[PDB]
Structure 1
Amino acid sequence: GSSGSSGPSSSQSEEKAPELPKPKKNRCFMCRKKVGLTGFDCRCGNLFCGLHRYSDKHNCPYDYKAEASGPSSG
């Protein structure tokens, strides 16, 4: 425990703030909307409100689509 008082001596910035923004915060990773239980875990390792879950909705980087049982050239 210590007060620790050192320059700058003048200070005009201090106020309660909400903990840092979680990496998920039970919120979509495309629109950033409260999904909580209505969340959707994509293969790319992200969360979606189901409306973006699709791969062609949030531009899913993953390739699982053209990885297994998917000889689709590309």
Structure 2
Amino acid sequence: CFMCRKKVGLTGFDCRCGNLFCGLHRYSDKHNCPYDYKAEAAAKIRKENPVVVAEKIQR
């Protein structure tokens, strides 16, 4: 239920700030969404990243 429009629409899109934004004001650029999008990107990419170890080390 975002301050602009005081919207309560069931369609309300519920963001990482848990807030059913106005249909037109659902974007972080618009509402200063206080979330660490870039930090989460770094963590996820580090987790999912494939690295070639060259398959030479052996017991």
- TM-score, with normalisation over the residues of structure 2? 0.52
Shift of 1:47: 1.8
Match of 2:6 in 1: 33
Across the two proteins, how many residue pairs are aligned to each other? 43
Shift of 1:70: 4.3
Distance 1:34 1:57 in 2: 15
Percent of aligned pairs sharing the same letter: 84
Distance 1:55 1:41 in 2: 12
Contact 2:7/2:20 (<8 A) preserved: no
Higher relative contact order (CA 8 A, sep 6+): 2
- List gaps (5 residues or longer) in structure 2: 44-59
Compute the RMSD of aligned alpha carbons. Answer: 2.2
How does 1:32-71 map onto structure 2 within 5 Å? 32-63=5-36, 65-70=37-42
- List gaps (5 residues or longer) in structure 1: 1-27
Greater helix proportion: 2
